[PDB]
RNA sequence: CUUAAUGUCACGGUACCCAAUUUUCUGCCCC
RNA sequence: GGGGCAGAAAAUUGGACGA
C-alpha cells in the first residue's frame, strides 16, 4: 500500500528478527535500532496523520530496545529510562485516538502494560503500583490473556498475583503454557493458590537454572525481587532459595570477564547480603549441640570472602589493564586455600557489612580452639567519622591527627569484640580480612573503649589482607632503593653491607624490574589517585600500579619493606566494588609474601627507623616508637600507624 | 529592628516553577532548581525564597567566622548544629551533605534558650520557630522573601538554557539539563525585608549580608534601607517568486536577506545592493528581479520603510526566519528529534551525613582575584539552542519534536545582542586545564551523597568566576560548513549547515576568584598557559568547535590582586568584593587593602606546567605558497556589496582588539575546517581508512588522530590566513568562466560563470600562513602519518580552495617555521610520439569548422573508482608539459575591458589585454581543461555533457539520440570521460594547472602589438541541422588553416570599414612561444593515463585550439612532455612510455608503435586537429546549392 | 498569594562531539 | 545582416558505538 504500510512491515519484520533468541545479542541491538530508525524517520513526516499501528510498533521497538539495554551496576542506564518513558509516552498518544480492531487493541493495551511493568521495576516512583495494577486491569478486561502465545501476558498475570488479586481461573493456562520459565510457575504456585511445595521445586529447579545464566540476565534480578517479596511476608521458602541463589552466584561469577563482564555485572550485594541473613538466622535457631551451628558460622565466612575482591585475584596484559583502568571511570572500552588451613596461633577474622541488615559482621577463628563466632555492630557513626577524618586528611595532611584520635576512638566503641577475650584471645596473631569500608579503617590502631584503653596492636600482632585466596601455601640478600635527596635519609643505611644485587641510589623505575627476589627495602614517595594510578616517585617518572602489575615480575615470595608516603591508604574515600587498590596491595598481588605499607604521609626518619629494624627480616617497633601515647601527643601517633602489615604467612 | 534587603545581580542567574515541597519531588526541575530562584503562574511575578537566602547567609557566617578562629569583635562562638532528627525528627526541608566547616575549640558555654550564641541565634534554634507551615511571624530572626522591585510577561525576564556536561577522556558530553537564565541588568533588583529581634548579633547578619557571594548561580550585592505583517509579505514574495518558477532560490535569498544585517541601513536605503551587468537590461538573478511587478531592490526598500520601528536587526533577522520557514513549508518543516542518548540528568536520588571540616588555627588564607582580558585570536562558537526552543514555559517539547530554526548553530547572544561568555564554558575549560595539569581528576559525578575529595574538584569548590559580555553588539558573521563524501571527494547529501561565530579579536574581561590557603601551583600554570606573552601564544581552548580550530582566547592585560582575608575581612565587606566594578580594577594602579600580587611565578618556573601544560599542545605553524589564483567561493556573501561577482573569496572579519573597533580591511584566509578536512582526507587516503564500512568501535589511525563521531580530535587546525597581500596591488583579479557547447561551438544558453578569487603567480606566490596543534599522547607512527600527509600538502597533490581541477589553489611549496619541533622539523629527454597522420583528405568548397561524429555508442563504467585511498594496482603522479603556438594565441583578460586604453580614440569599443596575474604573462587552466576535455570525449566517444537543448529554429529536446545525453546520477554510469575529467557527484581524477611562459620571443608586432579582429557572431546551429528530417550533426571542431595573415594584412582595411564600436581588439602571443604546464592526476588505471598522454601529444602533425578565432585560425598549440612522475618521485622510462599508452589503444581497440587511423572516428579527429604547416556564405545556403551538408 | 528555619557545595555539570562551500564547465563564436 | 550568454543543476540537516 503506502509508504507507511511498507515501511511499518518492514519495521515489524525487524522487530521479529530480534525478539527471537536465535538472533544473537551481538547483532540484535542494531536490528532493533534500524527498525526504530525507520519509525522515526516515518513519524517526523507526519506527526499527527500518523496510524495508531505505527505508534504501538514505536512503543513497542522502545520496549525491546528497552530490554536489550542492561544495568550497569548500581544506577541503571539512561538510555533505558527514556525508551521506556518514549515507549509509553507513544502508546499513550495511540490509545488516546485508537482507531483499530480488536486485535488492535489487545495489542496496544499488552505492549503498554509490560512496559509500565518494566517502568514500574525501574523507576517506581513515576508510574506507582495502583496506577500500574488500574492497567493491568484495564489490559486483562480487553483480551491481555493468552499465555500460550503471548509471554507478555503471562508477565502480566505474574504482576497481577504480585499486586494482589486472584487469578484461579488462569492458573490452568499458566502452568502448562510451554513459555512460562520457572519463576513464572514459582509465582503462579505461591500467589495463585498459595501453596509452598510445588512452589518448592519449581523454586530449586530455578536456583538450578541459574547456574548457567550470566550475571547480565535479568532472571538474576527477577530472583531476587521475588526473594524480597518472600522477605516482605514472613515465608520459611526464602532460606533455602537464599541460600541456592548464592551458590550458583559464586558457581557463575567465576566464567565471567573481569574486562567488560564484571564491574558493571556483579550489582549483587543485596543477593550475598540476603544470604548471610539467611545463613545467620538459620544459625539463630536453638542447637541440640554444637556442631552444625558452630560449622554455619563458617559459612557466613564464605559469605564475606566470596564477594570482597574477585577482580584483584584475576590480575598483551597491558593492553587489558589498561581497559580496566579505563572500565574503573565508567568510560568505554573497545587453588584457593582452605579457610581451616591456619598457621597455629593466628586467629583470622572475616567481615562483612550488611546494607539490607545496617549491622555489620565479624567472624573469628582460633586454630587452637576451632571455633567460630559472629557478632553483630552498627557501621553508620563509623562512616560518619571515616569521611570526616578522610575530608580533613586531604585538606589538611598532618592537621588530622585529632581525627586519626577520634576515629581510632570509635572503633572500639562500636566494635568491642575486638578486645574480648572470647572473641579474639590475647597473644595470638590476627589477620583481618575487611570489606569495602574496613580497608580503609586502620584497625590495628583501634582504641578499646575504656577510661584509658591501650591499643590493638598493643596486645595482638595485626595482619591485612583483602581477601582469602590472597594468601597461599630464597636468595637471602638483601636490596635498597632510594630517590631522595642527598640531603636527609642516609645516616648509613645507604652504606652498610647491603647488596651488590641491585641496591642503589637515585634508583629508576627499571631498576625496580631487576631483581632477584630480595625482601626488597623501597624509599620513595607516593601520591595516590582520587583510580589505581597510585604512582611511585622513582626516576624516569615513576612506577605505578599499572606497571606494578604489568612488569614487576621479580619480588615473588619478598618481604616488602616499602616505605613510601600515602601507600596503603591509596584507594579513596568511598567504595564501589570492596576491591583495595594500594600499592602495596599490587606488591602483595604479584606475589609479594607481605609488605608494610604506609597508609597515609610518613616521614623519613620513621621510614628509616622501619628499615633500621634488622633484627628479623614492627608491631614491636610501634609500640617502642611511642604509638601507646595517642592522647599524649596526636602528631607522633600519626606518623606511626601509617605502616600497617599486608600479608600472610 | 526591620532590615530592608536589595538585591543587584551582575551576571544571567536561573530561576525555576514555584512547585510545593510536597510538588518539588514530582519535578526533576524543580528539585534540580532549589538553588534558584522561584517563579509563579498568575506571565507572572518573580520572587527568591527567604530559606534560600538564609542557606546563603547561614554559609556566609560560618564560612566567615571559620576565617577569623571563630572569634567577632569579642564575643565568641561555638560549633552549632546541623544535625536533626536525634529525639524525634521533622526533618529539615534541605540536605546539606556538604563539609561543615568546624572549629579548634569553640568553647564558651553550652548555650540554651537564655544565651544563645550569636551564629546560633541567625540560625533560629532557640526560638518559637517551627518546622511545619509557619502559622505566625514570630521568629528570632525573620529571612521573608525578596521580590523585584504591571504584570510582567515571562519571556521578558527569563529566556532558556541548556548547559551541558562534557567528560574528560572524551570530547562528547554524555548529559545535559535545562536551564532558564535570566536577565541581570532591567529585572535584576529583588526586594525583601528581615527582622531581627536579639539586637547582641546584629553586627553578625550585616557581615553576613555584606560577604555572601553566592545567589542563584550569579554575583549579587545585598543593599541595606509586528511579525505579523512581516509573515504575509514573505508569503507574498514567496507566492510570487514561485509564479516565477524560481522558488529554489528563496533560501539564499533568506541567507542573503541575514547576512544583509551586517551591513548597515544604507545597502537598502541608498540602493547599494548589486545592479547586475552594466549592460544586461535584466538586473541581478535574485536583487533586481520584479515581486508583484515592483522591484525587489525597492520592494525590500519599501517593506524596510514599512518597519523603521523594529530595527535593522531586528527586520533582516525576521525577514529571513519567515522566509526559511514559507520555503520549508513547501519544498515539509525539517522537525529533529533523538532517541536515546538525550540523557537530561538531574540526579534526583538517605545518609544524611555530616563532616566537620577543621581548619589549622593560624592558617594563612587570603581571596586572589584575577582581572584581565580575554581575546579571541581565533574566532570563537559558543553553543546556544535554537530559537523558540529557549523560550522559558513552552517547555516539555514528551515524545515532541522540535522545529529547526533558520540558524543550525546559534551562537549565544544577550538580550542587547552582544556577545556574552558564559560562566558554565569557562568554568568548564578551566576543569579541563585543572584536570590536564594535575593529572589525577574525577569525572565529575551528579548527586553525589559526599563531595569528591579529588584535586580538581578542590579547587573549583573555592573558585568564583563572573559572566562577561563584550562591548560589541554587532552581527556575527556567518561561517557555512560542508561534508565531502570520500567515496566520490563531492558534497555528502544533506549535509550544509551554517556557524555563527563572532569576530576575532574582541575583548572579553576575564575574572576569576580563588578563596584558599595558598595560590596553587596548577593553577598559576593554567593562567601563564592562557597568558599571550611574546612567545607563548595563548592557550586558552575557550568554548565549542575545538577541533575546526574555533575557540582559542589569547588572555592578556592579566593583573593579579588579593586581599588578606584574616586581618583585612572588613575592607571586603566594604568593598563587595568588587563584585560587578571588575572593569574598575583594571584602569586602577585602589581600594583599601587589594595589594597586588608580587609572587606570580613566571611561565619558566612551574613545574606542572613543563611537565604536563607545555607538552599539552604542540604548535606546528607552517606557510603554504600557492602559485595560482586562490578561492573559497563565499556566495552568500557574494550576493552583496559592488561587483556583482557570483563567488567572491571568503575574507575573514578580524576586530581590532583596544583599537576603533572593527577592521574596515578585510583578511583573506581559508577555513580552518578546509584545513582539517584536507589532513584528514590526506590521512585517510594513506591510511586505508576512509570509505570503511562503518566506524562503531573503529580505532584506525583516523578515528584517533582526529576524532571520531565520540572521541574528541587529538589535532586542532586554524585559519590559514594570508599575509602576502601588501605587495600585490591586483590581489582580487576577475576571471571569467564560459561552458562551451559540444555542438555549438559557444556559449550555452546559461553558463556564463565569473569567479573573483585572489592574485598569485609563479614569480610572486600568495603566501598562506596556518597552524595545527598536537596532542601529547601521539606516537611515532601517528607522527609520521600527520608530517607525511604535509609533506603531500606540500607536494602538491591536494589543492587547496575551490577548482582546483582548474588550477586554483595549487601549492609551490611549505616552508616550516623554526618553531617547530625537532623530532617533527628533521622528520619532514622528453618523450615526443612518433606517429605521423597523413590527413591527405586534399594535400593539394571550403568548410568554415567541420563537424564529428562519433556514434551514439557508450560504455559507462558502473564500477567507480572511488576517491578513497589509493589503489596500489592504480599509478597517482604528476605530468609535466611543454606548451609551443605554432599559430598566435589570444587570451583576453577580462579583469581590464580598458587594458589597452584605446578608448580615447573612439570610446564604447572593447579593447582587451592578453591573460596575466601580477604581470606574468600565463594560460588559464580553464582553456586547457576543456581543451583536452573536449579531445579526450571525442576520442573516447564519451558524450555531449553540455548540449544547448531547449531549441527550435517542436522536438527540441528529441533532436539529439536519447542515448548520449549528459549523465544523471552514478546509478545509470559514468562515461570514460567522465571518469577521468568528473562530473557532478563525482569530482574528476586528473587535475589542471596554470601555464607559464619564461621563453621564447615576446609578443606579435604588426593601437601597437595588437592585431584587430573580424566579428564574431554567435554560433547558429540551424545551419548546421537545415531541415527537421536531420537528426542531428555531431561534434564541431575546427580547422587549423592560417588565415591570421589576412587580418594581419588588413587591419586597418577592418577597423574602420565595418563595426566601428563591435569590434574587439586585444594583444596577441606570437609563433613559437614555449609555456610550460602541469596537469596532475591521482588514482588513474593504465590506460586512462595512457589515454591522457595521447590527447595530450598525440604525435607530430597533430596540434590543438585555445583562445579566440579559432575559425580564423587563432591559437593553435602543441604540448609535449618532460617528466611523467609516479608515486606509489618515480620517472617512468623514456620507451615512448611502453605498456602505458599501448594498454591504452588495446581497452579502446574493442570500441610496435599502434595505429590510431585505423579506427574511423579516431581518424576524423586526427584528421580534424591536422596541422600543414610544418613544411609547404549565402549563396551556398541555398536549397538547390547543396541540400545534404556533410563532415 | 509567596518561602518555611537546630542542614540548599547545583559556581555540582563547556550544547559538547563528528563531517574540505564544494563537485561539473575553454570569454567564447557566422548566416 | 547594426550580437547573444551573463550562470545553471544540486546539497542547505544528517547525527551522536555501553556491554
Ligand atoms: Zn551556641
Ligand atoms: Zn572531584
Ligand atoms: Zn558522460
Same mark, same amino acid.
Given at each position: 500500500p503506502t509508504r507507511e504500510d511498507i515501511d511499518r512491515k518492514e519495521a515489524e519484520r525487524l522487530l521479529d528478527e530480534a525478539f527471537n533468541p536465535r538472533t544473537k545479542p551481538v547483532d540484535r541491538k542494531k536490528i532493533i535500532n534500524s527498525a526504530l530508525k525507520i519509525l522515526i524517520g516515518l513519524y517526523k513526516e507526519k506527526k499527527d496523520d500518523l496510524t495508531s499501528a505505527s505508534f504501538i510498533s514505536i512503543a513497542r521497538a522502545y520496549y525491546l530496545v528497552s530490554i536489550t539495554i542492561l544495568p550497569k551496576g548500581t544506577t541503571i542506564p539512561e538510555k533505558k529510562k527514556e525508551a521506556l518513558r518514549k515507549g509509553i509516552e507513544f502508546i499513550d498518544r495511540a490509545i488516546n485516538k485508537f482507531n483499530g480492531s480488536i486485535l488492535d487493541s489487545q495489542r496496544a493495551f499488552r505492549i503498554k502494560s509490560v512496559l509500565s511493568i518494566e517502568f514500574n521495576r525501574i523507576d517506581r516512583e513515576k508510574c506507582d503500583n495502583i496506577k500500574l495494577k488500574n492497567l493491568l486491569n484495564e489490559a486483562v478486561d480487553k483480551g491481555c490473556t493468552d499465555f500460550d502465545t503471548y509471554e507478555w501476558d503471562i508477565q502480566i498475570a505474574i504482576r497481577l498475583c504480585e499486586l494482589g488479586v486472584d487469578m484461579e481461573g488462569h492458573f490452568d493456562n499458566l502452568i502448562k503454557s510451554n513459555k512460562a520459565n520457572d519463576l513464572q510457575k514459582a509465582k503462579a504456585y505461591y500467589f495463585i493458590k498459595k501453596d509452598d511445595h510445588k512452589a518448592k521445586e519449581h523454586m530449586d529447579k530455578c536456583t538450578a537454572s541459574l547456574k548457567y545464566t550470566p550475571c547480565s540476565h535479568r532472571l538474576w534480578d527477577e530472583t531476587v525481587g521475588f526473594i524480597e517479596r518472600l522477605k516482605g511476608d514472613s515465608s520459611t521458602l526464602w532460606r533455602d532459595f537464599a541460600i541456592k541463589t548464592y551458590r550458583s552466584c559464586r558457581v557463575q561469577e567465576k566464567e565471567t570477564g573481569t574486562l567488560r563482564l564484571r564491574w558493571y555485572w556483579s550489582r549483587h550485594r543485596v543477593l550475598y547480603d540476603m544470604a548471610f541473613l539467611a545463613v545467620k538466622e538459620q544459625a539463630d535457631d536453638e542447637e541440640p549441640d554444637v556442631n552444625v551451628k558452630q560449622a554455619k558460622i563458617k559459612k557466613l565466612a564464605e559469605i564475606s570472602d566470596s564477594l570482597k575482591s574477585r577482580f584483584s585475584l584475576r590480575l598483551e596484559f597491558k593492553k587489558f589493564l589498561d581497559k580496566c583502568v579505563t572500565a574503573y571511570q565508567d568510560g568505554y572500552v573497545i587453588k584457593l586455600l582452605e579457610l581451616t588451613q591456619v598457621p597455629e596461633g593466628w586467629v583470622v577474622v572475616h567481615f562483612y557489612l550488611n546494607k539490607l541488615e545496617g549491622m555489620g559482621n565479624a567472624i573469628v577463628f582460633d586454630k587452637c580452639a576451632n571455633s567460630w563466632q559472629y557478632k553483630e555492630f552498627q557501621y553508620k557513626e563509623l562512616f560518619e567519622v571515616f569521611l570526616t577524618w578522610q575530608a580533613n586528611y586531604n585538606l589538611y595532611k598532618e592537621n588530622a591527627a585529632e581525627h586519626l584520635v577520634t576515629l581510632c576512638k570509635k572503633i572500639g566503641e562500636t566494635m568491642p569484640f575486638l578486645f574480648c577475650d572470647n572473641f579474639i584471645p590475647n597473644g595470638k596473631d590476627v589477620l583481618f580480612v575487611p570489606h569495602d569500608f574496613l580497608h580503609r579503617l586502620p584497625l590495628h590502631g583501634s582504641i578499646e573503649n575504656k577510661t584509658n584503653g591501650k591499643l590493638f596492636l598493643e596486645n595482638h600482632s595485626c595482619c591485612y589482607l583483602?581477601?582469602?585466596?590472597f594468601a597461599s601455601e630464597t636468595s637471602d640478600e638483601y636490596v635498597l632503593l632510594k630517590n631522595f635527596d642527598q640531603g636527609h635519609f642516609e645516616t648509613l643505611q645507604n652504606n652498610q653491607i647491603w647488596g651488590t644485587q641491585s641496591v642503589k641510589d637515585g634508583a629508576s623505575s627499571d631498576d625496580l624490574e631487576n631483581i632477584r627476589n630480595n625482601p626488597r627495602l623501597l624509599t620513595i614517595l607516593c601520591h595516590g589517585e582520587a583510580p589505581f594510578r597510585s604512582m611511585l616517585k622513582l626516576a624516569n617518572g615513576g612506577i605505578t600500579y599499572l606497571e606494578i602489575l604489568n612488569s614487576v615480575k621479580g619480588l615473588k615470595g619478598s618481604q616488602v619493606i616499602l616505605g613510601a608516603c600515602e601507600t596503603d591508604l591509596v584507594p579513596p574515600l568511598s567504595d564501589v566494588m570492596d576491591e583495595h587498590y594500594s600499592v602495596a596491595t599490587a606488591l602483595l598481588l604479584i606475589g609479594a609474601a607481605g609488605v608494610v605499607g604506609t597508609m597515609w604521609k610518613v616521614r623519613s626518619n620513621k621510614t628509616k627507623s622501619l628499615i633500621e629494624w634488622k633484627l628479623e627480616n614492627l608491631n614491636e617497633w610501634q609500640k617502642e616508637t611511642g604509638g601507646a601515647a595517642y592522647k599524649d601527643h596526636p602528631p607522633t601517633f600519626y606518623r606511626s600507624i601509617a605502616f600497617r602489615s599486608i600479608g600472610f604467612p | 529592628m526591620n532590615i530592608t534587603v536589595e538585591l543587584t545581580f551582575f551576571e544571567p542567574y536561573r530561576l525555576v516553577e514555584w512547585f510545593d515541597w510536597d510538588a518539588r519531588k514530582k519535578s526533576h526541575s524543580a528539585m534540580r532548581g532549589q538553588a534558584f530562584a522561584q517563579w509563579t503562574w498568575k506571565a507572572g511575578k518573580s520572587f527568591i525564597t527567604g530559606t534560600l537566602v538564609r542557606s546563603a547567609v547561614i554559609k556566609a557566617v560560618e564560612e566567615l567566622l571559620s576565617l577569623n578562629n571563630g572569634k567577632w569583635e569579642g564575643v565568641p562562638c561555638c560549633n552549632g548544629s546541623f544535625q536533626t532528627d536525634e529525639s524525634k525528627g521533622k526533618k529539615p526541608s534541605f540536605l546539606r551533605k556538604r563539609h561543615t566547616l568546624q572549629w579548634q575549640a569553640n568553647n564558651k558555654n553550652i548555650c540554651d534558650?537564655?544565651?544563645? #550564641?550569636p551564629f546560633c541565634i541567625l540560625l533560629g534554634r532557640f526560638d518559637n520557630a517551627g518546622k511545619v507551615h509557619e502559622r505566625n511571624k514570630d521568629y528570632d530572626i525573620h529571612f521573608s522573601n525578596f521580590d523585584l522591585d504591571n504584570d510582567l510577561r515571562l519571556v521578558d525576564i527569563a529566556s532558556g538554557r541548556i548547559l551541558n556536561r562534557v567528560d574528560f577522556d572524551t570530547g562528547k558530553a554524555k548529559d545535559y539539563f535545562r536551564t532558564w537564565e535570566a536577565d541581570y541588568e532591567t529585572y535584576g533588583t529583588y526586594t525583601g525585608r528581615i527582622t531581627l529581634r536579639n539586637e547582641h548579633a546584629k553586627k553578625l547578619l550585616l557581615a553576613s549580608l555584606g560577604f555572601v557571594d553566592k545567589l542563584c548561580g550569579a554575583l549579587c550585592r545585598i543593599e541595606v534601607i509586528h511579525n505579523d505583517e512581516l509573515r504575509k509579505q514573505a508569503e507574498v514574495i514567496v507566492e510570487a517568486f514561485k509564479q516565477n518558477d524560481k522558488l529554489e532560490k528563496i533560501r539564499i535569498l533568506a541567507d542573503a536577506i541575514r547576512t544583509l544585517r551586517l551591513h548597515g541601513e544604507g545597502v537598502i536605503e541608498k540602493d547599494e545592493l548589486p545592479d547586475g551587468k552594466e549592460e544586461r537590461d535584466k538586473g541581478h538573478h535574485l536583487w533586481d528581479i520584479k515581486v508583484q511587478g515592483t522591484a525587489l531592490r525597492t520592494k525590500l526598500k519599501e517593506l524596510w520603510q514599512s518597519n523603521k520601528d523594529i530595527g535593522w536587526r531586528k527586520f533582516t533577522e525576521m525577514l529571513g526566519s519567515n522566509l526559511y520557514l514559507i520555503y520549508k513549508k513547501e519544498t515539509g518543516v525539517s522537525t529533529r528529534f533523538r532517541i536515546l542518548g538525550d540523557t537530561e540528568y538531574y540526579s534526583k536520588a538517605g545518609s544524611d551525613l555530616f563532616i566537620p571540616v577543621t581548619p589549622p588555627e593560624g592558617i594563612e588564607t587570603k581571596e586572589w582575584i584575577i582581572v584581565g582580558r580575554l581575546k579571541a585570536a581565533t574566532p570563537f562558537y559558543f553553543g546556544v539552542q535554537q530559537p523558540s526552543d529557549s523560550i522559558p514555559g513552552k517547555e516539555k517539547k514528551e515524545d515532541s519534536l522540535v522545529i529547526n530554526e533558520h540558524a543550525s548553530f546559534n551562537i549565544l547572544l544577550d538580550k542587547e545582542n552582544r556577545y556574552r561568555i558564559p560562566r558554565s564554558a569557562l568554568r568548564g575549560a578551566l576543569r579541563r586545564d585543572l584536570r590536564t595539569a594535575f593529572g589525577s581528576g574525577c569525572n565529575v559525578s551528579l548527586g553525589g551523597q559526599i563531595l569528591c575529595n579529588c584535586k580538581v574538584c578542590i579547587e573549583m569548590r573555592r573558585i568564583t568566576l563572573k559572566d562577561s559580555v563584550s562591548d560589541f553588539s554587532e552581527p556575527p558573521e556567518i561561517r557555512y560548513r560542508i561534508a565531502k563524501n570520500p567515496g566520490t571527494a563531492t558534497v555528502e547529501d544533506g549535509s550544509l549547515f551554517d556557524i555563527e561565530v563572532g569576530p576575532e579579536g574582541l575583548t572579553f574581561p576575564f575574572v576569576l576568584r580563588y578563596r584558599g590557603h595558598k595560590f596553587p601551583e596548577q593553577l598559576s600554570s593554567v593562567i601563564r598557559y592562557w597568558e599571550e606573552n611574546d612567545g607563548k601564544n595563548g592557550m586558552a581552548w575557550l568554548g565549542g568547535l575545538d577541533s575546526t580550530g574555533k575557540g582559542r582566547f589569547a588572555l592578556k592585560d592579566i593583573k593579579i590582586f588579593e586581599w588578606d582575608?584574616?586581618?583585612?575581612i572588613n575592607e571586603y565587606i566594604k568593598e563587595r568584593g568588587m563584585r560587578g566594578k571588575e572593569k574598575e580594577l583594571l584602569e586602577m594602579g585602589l581600594p583599601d587593602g587589594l595589594i597586588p600580587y608580587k609572587?606570580?611565578?613566571?611561565?619558566? #618556573?612551574?613545574f606542572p606546567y613543563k611537565e604536563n601544560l607545555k607538552p599539552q599542545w604542540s604548535e606546528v605553524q607552517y606557510t603554504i605558497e600557492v602559485g595560482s589564483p586562490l578561492l573559497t567561493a563565499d556566495t552568500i556573501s557574494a550576493l552583496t556589496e559592488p561587483g556583482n561577482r557570483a563567488a567572491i573569496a571568503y575574507k575573514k572579519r578580524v576586530y581590532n582588539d583596544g583599537n576603533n573597533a572593527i577592521e574596515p580591511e578585510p583578511r583573506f584566509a581559508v577555513k580552518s575546517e578546509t584545513h582539517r578536512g584536507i589532513f584528514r582526507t590526506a590521512v585517510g587516503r594513506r591510511t586505508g581508512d576512509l570509505g570503511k564500512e562503518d566506524h562503531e568501535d573503529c580505532t584506525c589511525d583516523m578515528c584517533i588522530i582526529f576524532g571520531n563521531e565520540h572521541e574528541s580530535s587529538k589535532i586542532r587546525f586554524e585559519d590559514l590566513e594570508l599575509i602576502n597581500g601588501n605587495e600585490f596591488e591586483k590581489l582580487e583579479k576577475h576571471i571569467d568562466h564560459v561552458a562551451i557547447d559540444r555542438f555549438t561551438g559557444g556559449a550555452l544558453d546559461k553558463a556564463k560563470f565569473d569567479t573573483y578569487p585572489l592574485a598569485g603567480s609563479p614569480k610572486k606566490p600568495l603566501k598562506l600562513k596556518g597552524r595545527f596543534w598536537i596532542k601529547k599522547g601521539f606516537s611515532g607512527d601517528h607522527k609520521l602519518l600527520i608530517t607525511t600527509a604535509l609533506s603531500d600538502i606540500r607536494d602538491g597533490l591536494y589543492p587547496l580552495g575551490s577548482k582546483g581541477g582548474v588550477g586554483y589553489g595549487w601549492v609551490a611549496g611549505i616552508s616550516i617555521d623554526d618553531n617547530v619541533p625537532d623530532d617533527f622539523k628533521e622528520m619532514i629527454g622528453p618523450i615526443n610520439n612518433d606517429y605521423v597522420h597523413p590527413g591527405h583528405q586534399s594535400p593539394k568548397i571550403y568548410y568554415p569548422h567541420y563537424f564529428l561524429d562519433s556514434g551514439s555508442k557508450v560504455y559507462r563504467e558502473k564500477d567507480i573508482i572511488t576517491h578513497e585511498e589509493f589503489t596500489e594496482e592504480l599509478l597517482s603522479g604528476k605530468i609535466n608539459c611543454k606548451l609551443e603556438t605554432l599559430t598566435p594565441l589570444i587570451i583576453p583578460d577580462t579583469s581590464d575591458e580598458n587594458g589597452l586604453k584605446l578608448q580615447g580614440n573612439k570610446p564604447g569599443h572593447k579593447n582587451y589585454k592578453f591573460f596575466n596575474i601580477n604581470g606574468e604573462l600565463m594560460i588559464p587552466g580553464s582553456e586547457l581543461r576543456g581543451m583536452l576535455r573536449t579531445h579526450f570525449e571525442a576520442l573516447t566517444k564519451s558524450c555531449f555533457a553540455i548540449f544547448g537543448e531547449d531549441s527550435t529554429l517542436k522536438t527540441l529536446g528529441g533532436k539529439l539520440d536519447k542515448a548520449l545525453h549528459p549523465c544523471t546520477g552514478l546509478s545509470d554510469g559514468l562515461c570514460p570521460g567522465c571518469h577521468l575529467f568528473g562530473t557532478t557527484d563525482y569530482k574528476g581524477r586528473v587535475k589542471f594547472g596554470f601555464a607559464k611562459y619564461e621563453n621564447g620571443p615576446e609578443w606579435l608586432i604588426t593601437p601597437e602589438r595588437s592585431l584587430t579582429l573580424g566579428v564574431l557572431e554567435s554560433p547558429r546551429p540551424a545551419f548546421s541541422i537545415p531541415d527537421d528530417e536531420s537528426e542531428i550533426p555531431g561534434r564541431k571542431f575546427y580547422l587549423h588553416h592560417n588565415g591570421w595573415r589576412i587580418i594581419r594584412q588588413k587591419q586597418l582595411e577592418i577597423r574602420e570599414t565595418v563595426q566601428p564600436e563591435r569590434n574587439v581588439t586585444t594583444e596577441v602571443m606570437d609563433k613559437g612561444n614555449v609555456f610550460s604546464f602541469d596537469v596532475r592526476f591521482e588514482n588513474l588505471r593504465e590506460w586512462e593515463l595512457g589515454l591522457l598522454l595521447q590527447s595530450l601529444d598525440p604525435g607530430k602533425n597533430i596540434a590543438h585550439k585555445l583562445g579566440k578565432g579559432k575559425p580564423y585560425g587563432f591559437g593553435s598549440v602543441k604540448i609535449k612532455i618532460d617528466s611523467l612522475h609516479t608515486f606509489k618521485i618515480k620517472r617512468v622510462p623514456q620507451s615512448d612510455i611502453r605498456e602505458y599508452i599501448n594498454k591504452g589503444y588495446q581497452k579502446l581497440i574493442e570500441w610496435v608503435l599502434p595505429q590510431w587511423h585505423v579506427i574511423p572516428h579516431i581518424d576524423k579527429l586526427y584528421k580534424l586537429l591536422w596541422v600543414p604547416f610544418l613544411n609547404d556564405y549565402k549563396k551556398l545556403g541555398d536549397k538547390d546549392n547543396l541540400p545534404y551538408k556533410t563532415r
Open positions: 583483602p581477601a582469602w585466596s | 534558650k537564655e544565651e544563645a #550564641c582575608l584574616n586581618q583585612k609572587f606570580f611565578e613566571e611561565r619558566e #618556573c612551574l
